């Protein structure tokens, strides 16, 4: 029993973390085979950060402009190029700790584990979700650039996020491992807004199933709704509309618990309409939207 925010084991990602220095900036790099990935803004001076021209900035640099350290072992940079908002630094040594991996673009609603690093060194791990507005509500400090987000499928590490920056509202923006930002964001030190965020309905319901599997049952009722009537109420409280596809995903959980998806939706409607009245679901008064149906199944 018990239900916790759970990150994947981070060992395989730890042996990929290195330190990357250009000028007076030190941040984190991801070392896979003979390539080191890091945010490209590592080449910027304070004044550059304001209105950078990255192509211009990168041609004015060389292989010796970059210092890469794995532990205290110095890695020799023998090549460099731009990969959208990331630099690909080619090194003369292949990472012997390279796991089976792939690069994935994570979808809004989906989750991943963040390995927050400072000075090339793993500092902490936590579970995170890609918001519908394409930001992440992370916990990051200066120097955390290059920290990555990942999932594990069997043996394979799927890298999906690399950290770049924090927006004025305190939320975070970054890229996939091809250097394309999630969302409307650009790597410039200028005020940027995200779109209005919505609640990941599919995850909320998944977390409701997790509560039932774990003995919390107070919020259940015999009321029932149609998908359409649920969505009518959902959007009014800033929830994502739920689709038949989403209903089909909750199938296995619905079967394990004996609770129809539409019945759980009616439970959610009442919670939305009437609140909780001091009571808690899995020790929380906030309706949790950062566990996917998969995260629930995997943990339960």
């Amino acid at each position: 029993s018990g239900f916790r925010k759970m990150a994947f084991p981070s060992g395989k990602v730890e042996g990929c973390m290195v330190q990357v220095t250009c000028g007076t900036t030190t941040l984190n790099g991801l070392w896979l085979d003979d390539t080191v990935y890091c945010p490209r803004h590592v080449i910027c001076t304070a004044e550059d950060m304001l209105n950078p021209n990255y192509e211009d900035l990168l041609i004015r640099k060389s292989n010796h402009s970059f210092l890469v350290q794995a532990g205290n072992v110095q890695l020799r940079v023998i090549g460099h190029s731009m990969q959208n908002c990331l630099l690909r630094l080619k090194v003369d040594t292949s990472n012997p700790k390279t796991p089976k991996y792939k690069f994935v673009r994570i979808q809004p609603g989906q989750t991943f584990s963040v390995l927050a690093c400072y000075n090339g060194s793993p500092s902490g791990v936590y579970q995170c979700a890609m918001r519908p507005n394409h930001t992440i509500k992370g916990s990051f400090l200066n120097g955390s650039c290059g920290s990555v987000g990942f999932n594990i499928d069997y043996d394979c590490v799927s890298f999906c996020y690399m950290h770049h920056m924090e927006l004025p509202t305190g939320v975070h923006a970054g890229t996939d491992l091809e250097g394309k930002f999630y969302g409307p964001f650009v790597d410039i030190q200028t005020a940027q807004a995200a779109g209005t965020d919505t609640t990941i309905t599919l995850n909320v319901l998944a977390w409701l199933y997790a509560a039932v599997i774990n003995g919390d049952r107070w919020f259940l009722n015999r009321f029932t709704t149609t998908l359409n009537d649920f969505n009518l109420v959902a959007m009014k409280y800033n929830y994502e509309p739920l689709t038949q596809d989403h209903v089909d995903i909750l199938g296995p959980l619905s079967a394990q618990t004996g609770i129809a998806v539409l019945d759980m939706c009616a439970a959610l409607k009442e919670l939305l309409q009437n609140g909780m009245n001091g009571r808690t679901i899995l020790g929380s008064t906030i309706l949790e939207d950062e566990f996917t149906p998969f995260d629930v199944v995997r943990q339960c």
Binding site: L27, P39, F140, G143, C145, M165, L167, H172, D187, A191
Partner: peptide, 4 residues
Amino acid sequence: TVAH
């Protein structure tokens, strides 16, 4: 906007 702060670069980390």
